Design a protein around this ligand. Structure first.
Ligand code: GTP
Lengths: 374, 61, 240, 176, 49, 50
């Protein structure tokens, strides 16, 4: 009855203007995930350079307040655990490490130390592909998904697994999963475009629905309102589509491609890599960024008001399913100098937000850049 | 505030080029640019992961 | 907000158990065995789809019977083995030790003068932490064997698990009792999945189950759980 | 005052209960989907179908719930009855035991359902006349003795199936 | 008989994807060497400028 | 008829024994192919990023 979607939702009528606050490059290569501590006091970004870096949300008026590197391999997913006390990270090394964060006052330097660890045999589980943490009081389970389809709920209260699910690999590689804010159900998105719903109460596979284009589920999120809807980001055409798992109908879609809406023909190579969704004032906001490196603010209540956040007006402006279609407009005097391109210049891999006294967007790309916006 | 901006700005540009961390100081406005514009900084023009390290942030803050 | 309970030694009344129904197909022997011994033809397995089975209910403990075996009164069956009989067991709650067991054997006729067991199921009267069995239970009936009350029981009616339906049934009952969070859109799907699983188990296996029920003792609109306890178990030893 | 959906005025949650094999799923399927089938899948837990109907010019949305009738999926306390607007007790007119257990299903209503919930005794499988055991008079005497409406029916042949659910919807509207 | 063909075709798919994986890693290796040349051309042009 | 039943029962058993072996093999093809797919889905992003 009372599961809040966000510990701190966006301010009322929040509209990210696209002002860059911090340009960060402390990572040697591609950043894989951006996660914000549920306190919004810190956030963390992991990278293919094998390091993870933790950042102070309040210092985004900049420096990696903490850093860790002693796992090796590409660290490609992390999550906080409903507080800045714990932060878990995982690498293609198959190591799952529970880092404890030490919060200190200004005079004494902070530190990170590993306080829990697991290793996955590459022949029997493979590395993780995604993970999520969700408290239930009696347990502090860290669910994570592995290449062999195992989805394991590691209870951070001990070494015991709360539960384990065996995704049918005939549906392809697990590319992302999400869990209900109510913790009643779960949905697995795959490289072949299949969403497979699991009822976490019974731990049974209740349903399987497949994208008609049979294309990779790049991100998966529960819907902030409709308890049976899953926001599945799909490869090609920047397609973000809400799927009602109670019936399998694709019943809302965001589209931004040269290909006409929902067409299976030659899809654009661009794809959405990060989706942030919030109910706000009951007017749900969905913010997407990806391989076209253009952050799009989508207003699901008034889609005509949707706009590109990652760029000024120097850039070219823009089946019974409610599809929002983006069509580029069919559009010298040196009226002041040309400014530097503020946006990313490489594939954006994730989007996150924090609300420390203002609504900031964090974005990161495959070159290791991390950018803060407001 | 303009001096704070300009000096912090220069230092940020200095760090972006991986200039010698021990030489740069937050007050020596023109000397900082001199180390950046002269051939002494072999890395000038390179684009890569600068870090604005703690030993240089603590001097500013 | 409150848990109400009583000690097994304070409740000086006879234990009572409802023999419910028996669910599941009964394995018919191939006629090859009927040729080996022709008296099989007259057993209740072959003469009628539902035979007039009966259930014995001996309370065992430490591998010894605590008392004489109570048995279900005769009830005619046509299409469903269903007894709705509260057997007043011959032992009282203070007479029961922590490892007390009911050994529910199901019997059928085998010609004149000779009963034969359809199956048997043994369930401990006290749960994981000494509370007496609180309600309806579906016990796995081990076929063709008489229920054994030795400890450990070779024919346990319950599992700690280890198969789908033993877990999904517990969750189903918990969901019915309202213990599990209701979600109409999920339930309408997950229970279809459990239906498929159960119907598969009903085909790939021929196990049967015996429903039983224990009386929920009440007082002033409160229901008291019975906890295995001992008079003098209340005092820690005064060792100096 | 309260919010009101433009499609339906009243949401009447109906619930079907009764012993296993009495035909609750068949009745639910015949009413909400006009389909019938010999294949028996023993229901577990809950199932429901929505059917929209019209009575006295009012659009009535019926959410009909089908509970598991088997011993193994039943429990002493039940929370399916909670919030039911009307409850149908089904029995198989070809099995006296299912009819006898109606007495026991009724006391579950008086214990867990709404204090004045609508009740309706339904006698499915009336098409098996050569196998019927209860008399219509035996059932009517019992139903009237408790004031609950009653309709013998057949999911197989749709016989009185529609009328059985429509009658309870009307009875609930009459109650509110 | 349907499984024998599947085992064959899945094995051919495993071989094909493994060969494709090899060419992508080699292509990225080569493209990185060119990107290195681009970044050095840019570094030299920038420094001269 | 018992002889024929026994012979056919062994045939069904031994043919199904191959079916379950192929099930383990196909399960292994998926388990391995999923790994090659994971790698491929990164090389494609590295290629596009480079
Ligand atoms: N002749 C006849 N047979 C029926 C009728 N309705 C149901 N049946 C038979 O009874 C079987 C079981 O019907 P169900 O509706 O599944 O019984 P149920 O009440 O749902 O039983 P549970 O799901 O276990 O609670 C069906 O498969 C049919 O074979 C009917 O109206 N006439």
């Amino acid at each position: 009855e009372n599961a809040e979607w966000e510990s701190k939702p966006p301010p009322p009528g929040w509209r990210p203007k696209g002002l860059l606050v911090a340009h960060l490059h402390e990572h040697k290569s591609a950043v894989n995930r951006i996660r914000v501590s549920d306190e919004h006091s810190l956030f963390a970004t992991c990278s293919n350079d094998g390091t993870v870096k933790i950042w102070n949300s309040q210092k985004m008026e900049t420096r990696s307040i903490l850093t860790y590197s002693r796992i090796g391999g590409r660290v490609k997913t992390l999550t906080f655990c409903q507080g800045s006390h714990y932060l878990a990270i995982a690498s293609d090394n198959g190591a799952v490490q529970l880092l404890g964060i030490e919060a200190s006052k200004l005079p004494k330097s902070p530190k990170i130390h590993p306080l829990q660890s697991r290793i996955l045999d590459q022949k029997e589980d493979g590395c993780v592909v995604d993970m999520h943490h969700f408290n239930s009081g009696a347990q502090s389970v860290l669910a994570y998904a592995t290449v062999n389809g195992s989805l394991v709920g590691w209870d951070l209260r001990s070494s015991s697994n709360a539960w384990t699910l065996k995704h049918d690999l005939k549906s392809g590689l697990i590319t992302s999963f999400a869990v209900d804010i109510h913790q009643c159900w779960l949905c697995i998105g795959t490289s072949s475009g299949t969403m497979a719903c699991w009822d976490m109460r019974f731990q049974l596979p209740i349903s399987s629905h497949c994208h008609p284009s049979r294309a990779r589920i790049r991100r998966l999120s529960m819907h902030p309102l409709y308890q049976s809807w899953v926001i599945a980001a799909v490869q090609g055409n920047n397609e973000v589509s809400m799927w009602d798992m109670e019936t399998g109908d694709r019943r809302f879609t965001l589209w931004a491609s040269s290909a006409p809406p929902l067409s299976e023909l030659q899809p654009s190579p661009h794809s959405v890599h990060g989706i942030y969704c919030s109910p706000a004032d009951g007017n749900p906001i969905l913010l997407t960024a990806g391989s076209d490196m253009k952050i799009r603010f989508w207003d699901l209540a008034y889609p005509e008001r949707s706009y590109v956040v990652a760029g000024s007006t120097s850039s070219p402006s823009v089946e019974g399913t409610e599809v929002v279609q983006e069509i580029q407009n069919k559009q010298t005097p040196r009226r002041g100098p040309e400014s530097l391109p503020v946006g990313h210049h490489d594939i954006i891999t994730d989007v996150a937000t924090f609300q420390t006294t203002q609504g900031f967007i964090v974005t990161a790309s495959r070159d290791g850049i991390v950018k803060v916006w407001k | 505030r303009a001096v704070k901006k300009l000096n912090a700005n220069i230092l940020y540009l200095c760090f972006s080029q991986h200039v010698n961390l021990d030489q740069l100081q937050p007050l020596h406005t023109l000397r900082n640019l001199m180390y950046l514009v002269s051939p002494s900084s072999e890395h000038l023009g390179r684009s890569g992961p600068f870090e604005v390290r703690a030993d240089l942030e603590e001097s500013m803050e | 907000e409150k848990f109400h309970y009583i000690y097994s030694c304070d409740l000086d009344i006879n234990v009572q158990l409802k023999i419910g129904s028996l669910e599941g197909k009964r394995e018919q022997k191939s006629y090859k065995a009927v040729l080996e011994d022709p008296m099989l033809k007259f057993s209740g397995l072959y003469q009628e789809t539902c035979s007039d089975l009966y259930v014995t209910c001996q309370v065992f403990a430490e591998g010894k019977p605590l008392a004489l075996p109570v048995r279900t009164s005769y009830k005619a069956f046509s299409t469903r083995w269903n007894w709705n009989e509260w057997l007043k067991l011959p032992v009282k709650y203070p007479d029961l030790p922590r490892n007390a067991q009911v050994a529910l054997t199901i019997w059928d006729v085998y010609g004149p003068g000779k009963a034969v067991p359809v199956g048997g199921t043994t369930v401990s009267l006290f749960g994981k932490y000494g509370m007496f069995r609180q309600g309806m239970h579906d016990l796995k009936v081990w076929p063709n064997v008489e229920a054994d009350g030795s400890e450990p029981t070779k024919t346990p009616g319950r599992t700690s698990s280890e198969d789908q339906m033993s877990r999904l049934a517990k969750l189903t009952k918990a969901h019915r009792q309202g213990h599990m969070v209701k979600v109409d859109w999920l339930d309408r799907l997950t229970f279809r999945e459990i239906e498929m699983i159960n119907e598969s188990e009903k085909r790939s296996s021929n196990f049967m189950y015996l429903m039983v029920e224990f009386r929920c003792v009440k007082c002033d609109d409160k229901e008291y759980g019975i906890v295995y306890y001992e008079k003098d178990g209340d005092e820690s030893s005064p060792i100096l | 005052m309260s919010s009101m959906n433009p499609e339906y005025d009243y949401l009447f949650k109906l619930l079907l209960i009764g012993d296993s094999g009495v035909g609750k799923s068949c009745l639910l399927l015949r009413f909400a989907d006009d389909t019938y089938t010999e294949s028996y899948i023993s229901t577990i837990g809950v199932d429901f179908k929505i059917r929209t109907i019209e009575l006295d010019g009012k659009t009535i949305k019926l959410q009909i719930w089908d509970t598991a009738g088997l011993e193994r999926f039943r429990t002493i306390t039940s929370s399916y009855y909670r919030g039911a607007h009307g409850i149908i007790v089904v029995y198989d007119v070809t099995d006296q035991e299912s009819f006898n257990n109606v007495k026991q299903w009724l006391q579950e209503i008086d214990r867990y359902a709404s204090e004045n919930v609508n009740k309706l005794l339904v006698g499915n499988k009336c098409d098996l006349t050569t196998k019927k055991v209860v008399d219509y008079t035996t059932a009517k005497e019992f139903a009237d003795s408790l004031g609950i409406p009653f309709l013998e029916t057949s999911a197989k042949n749709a016989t009185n199936v529609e009328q059985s659910f429509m009658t309870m919807a009307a009875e609930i509207k009459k109650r509110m | 008989q349907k499984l024998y063909s599947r085992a064959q075709r899945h094995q051919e798919k495993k071989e094909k994807i493994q060969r494709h994986n090899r060419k992508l890693g080699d292509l990225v290796e080569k493209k990185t060497i060119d990107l290195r040349s681009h970044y050095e051309r840019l570094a030299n042009l920038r420094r001269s400028h | 008829v018992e002889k024929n039943r026994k012979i056919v029962a062994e045939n069904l058993e031994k043919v199904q024994a191959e079916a379950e072996r192929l099930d383990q093999e196909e399960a292994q093809y998926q388990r391995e192919y999923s790994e090659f797919k994971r790698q491929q889905l990164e090389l494609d992003d590295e290629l596009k990023s480079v």
